[PDB]
Design a protein around this ligand. Sequence first.
Ligand code: NI
Length: 341
Amino acid sequence: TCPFYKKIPGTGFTVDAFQYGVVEGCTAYFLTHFHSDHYAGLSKHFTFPVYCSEITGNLLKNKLHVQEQYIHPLPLDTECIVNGVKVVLLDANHCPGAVMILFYLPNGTVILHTGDFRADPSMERSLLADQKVHMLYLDTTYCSPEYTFPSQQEVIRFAINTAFEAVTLNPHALVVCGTYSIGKEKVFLAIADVLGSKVGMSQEKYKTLQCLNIPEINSLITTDMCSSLVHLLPMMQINFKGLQSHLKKCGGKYNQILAFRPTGWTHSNKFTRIADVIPQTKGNISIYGIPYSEHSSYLEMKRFVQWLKPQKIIPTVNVGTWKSRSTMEKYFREWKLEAGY
Ligand code: NI
């Protein structure tokens, strides 16, 4: 059955609730983004209205075969009316197509559902600046002070410099980047751009990326693995055995692999700066775990909330244990006391 934190009171709406069958009294199903924990349940047999971004809708039509008549894409940063309720979609700074949803209830309550997000001060100048929020349904993925991470920009600087140096020293090295869902495309696109190469990938992954409106994508991606020195592989193949095997498949075009695993967080962050990151190496294969996150750090999250000053916070992540829930609730109290709301 559907959890309460996926239900929008005073409406017929749900958010990211497609794995529960027909939800009682739900007249419209919102999808914040195309990640499997959120879309789980959608298919060509779904016949209720789905509201989402343009990019998410492209992905529903092409990858899951949802019929066009049931997909209702909305433009961003635009007041729209859904079953008599005003809504606005905002950029969530997550993966492509990912949104936050603002709901303006008939009785005057205003609700912000962040979906998955990486808070940023640029959000303090959208349609959020323009009114009060009574309830915040918050992506609390990294809601603990140990989660610190660098900027996406610092992480991409590290990756480009590392790959550029490696291929300059050995023009026969291959660079590999792991992926398992949309998101984190800057990793592999920025490396390919500095090396003067396209990113080679499976036909299935190329079709996924063509669904995204990313300008100049014919320009950075390809299915011709032969002509490329940056290859994209499933995240599960980013280990010494998987990569030895891949190297064998390239027919002696290459003699070394430098691979990257963009992860959310790793406890190395508590003791190490980005400049100090080192790989795991075996033979002619090196693997770098880099802290490229598409979720808020603890400090980012805290800043957002102390700026927005919601009347009530409803966590959407880590809610399944009493200890985590209690931990989060204690931080929310601190933030409120410190900010004076
Ligand atoms: Ni996500």
